[PDB]
């Protein structure tokens, strides 16, 4: 980075360069210089000039060149994990279709209704306003296929969780949601009851249409994709991101699909669950999922009501997930780095046993 | 109620026994997944 100072008839520019000690926000894996204890560095150079205007333009152009370089490096890093997919093979007959559907994430800032088509090796979303806003999803790349009915919500949903992330517009996403809001403005006690009945009929019709279409996607996959429906009665409230949301268990996953960002936790990928802030006098605990892939960041579900603790413990046991409980929130970002550094030494010592508070294994005998 | 809480708590002893079997199962699973030869071959992420 650099600075510019005006002093009498002269303009000063200080240019600062990358050196250890005055390091940038880059991680330890990629340095802007080659590693070297014996390497000396040019930390800063200060120049002066009588021409103030040009020297200000030069400083602007250096700053712009840095912004363009950083933007190109971010764009490269966002593209490195985008696996090139096969091309969608169009169905040679009349394709099965679902009309008046919204897509999330939207490929364009403008929310537009589209049509979803079933093809031989995947699904295609196609906007009527622009042919270029097509979203193609191969069956081979779908990991999980969810159907969420409109019963207590104002929208019906068809959610595709992906194995490899897709570029939709400018956003990389693992999740592609297809939905249609039933929310309709409808206005003595007979008319209101007729509107409420018409809304219930519309909800039931949309749920039947979307369910049938989701079954037709599962059938078209030749048994590669199972259709999952959430168990609402087993749902609990929590905060995985920034809002309180109803987390819903399915057959194979813990999901939240209503609000963005979406939560999709596959139960088989969990190594251990940790219940934080389980202590007398707290109203709420936190739940932490650790994955079998230690490179994957841990998932937090915060502010779960303590009334649901024994239910969550039972549910984790019924799913064969080990759990531990603790009074304190752990620094998982340090723990997972230690475990990544030597996974073998971690299991040699005892592995996940350290999460069980303190292993005193002795009678407290506090009473005298 | 006392015989139901005894029954519910014996189901909770089975819950704990399952949880203990799960912790012992994962310990052994991890010990198998990671061998001392992989630890010797440490792909140190020297800054590239």
């Amino acid at each position: 980075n650099g600075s510019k100072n005006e002093e009498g008839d002269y303009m000063y520019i200080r240019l600062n360069f990358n050196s250890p000690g005055m390091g940038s926000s880059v991680k330890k894996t990629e340095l802007p210089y080659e590693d070297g204890d014996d390497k000396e560095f040019v930390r800063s150079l200060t120049f002066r000039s009588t021409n103030k205007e040009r020297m200000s333009e030069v400083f602007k152009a250096i700053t712009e060149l840095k912004k363009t370089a950083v933007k190109r490096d971010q764009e490269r890093k966002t593209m490195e994990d985008v696996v090139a997919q096969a091309q969608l093979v169009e169905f040679k007959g009349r394709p099965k279709k679902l009309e008046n559907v919204f897509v999330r994430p939207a490929p364009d800032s403008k929310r537009v209704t589209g049509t979803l088509f079933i093809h031989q090796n995947g699904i295609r979303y196609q906007s009527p306003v622009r042919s270029d806003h097509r979203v193609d999803i191969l069956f081979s790349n779908i990991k999980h296929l969810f159907f969420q009915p409109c019963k207590e919500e104002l929208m019906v949903i068809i959610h595709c969780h992906l194995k490899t992330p897709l570029m939709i517009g400018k956003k990389k996403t693992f999740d592609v949601q297809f939905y249609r809001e039933v929310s309709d403005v409808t206005v003595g006690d007979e008319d209101e009851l007729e509107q409420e009945q018409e809304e219930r009929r519309r909800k039931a019709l949309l749920d039947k249409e979307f369910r049938r279409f989701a079954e037709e996607i599962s059938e078209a996959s030749n048994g590669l994709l199972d259709l999952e429906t959430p168990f609402r009665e087993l749902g609990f409230t929590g905060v995985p991101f920034r809002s309180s949301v109803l987390c819903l268990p399915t057959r194979d996953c813990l999901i939240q699909l209503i609000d963005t960002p979406f939560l999709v936790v596959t139960l088989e990928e969990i190594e251990v669950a940790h219940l934080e802030r389980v202590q007398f006098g707290l109203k709420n605990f936190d739940l932490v999922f650790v994955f079998k892939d230690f490179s994957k960041p841990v998932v937090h579900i915060n502010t779960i009501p303590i009334e649901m603790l024994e239910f969550v413990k039972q549910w984790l046991t019924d799913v064969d997930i080990p759990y531990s409980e603790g009074a304190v929130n752990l620094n998982w970002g340090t723990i997972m780095k230690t475990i990544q550094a030597d996974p073998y030494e971690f299991f040699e010592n005892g592995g996940w046993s350290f999460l069980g508070g303190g292993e005193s294994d002795d009678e407290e005998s506090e009473e005298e | 109620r006392n015989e139901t809480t005894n029954t519910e708590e014996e189901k909770e002893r089975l819950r704990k026994e399952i949880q203990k079997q799960l912790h012992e199962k994962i310990q052994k699973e991890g010990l198998a997944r990671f061998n001392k030869s992989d630890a010797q071959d440490g792909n140190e992420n020297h800054a590239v």
């Binding site: 202590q279 007398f280 409980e325 009074a327 069980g356 508070g357 292993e359 005193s360 294994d361 009678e363 407290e364 005998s365 506090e366 009473e367 | 809480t5 708590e9 909770e12 704990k16």
Partner: peptide
């Protein structure tokens, strides 16, 4: 009952205010 359960989940023989 539940205090004994919680003290047994922490491998402790004595019930303390924490378990209550």
């Amino acid at each position: 009952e539940l205090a004994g359960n919680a003290a047994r989940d922490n491998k402790k023989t004595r019930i303390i205010p924490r378990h209550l």
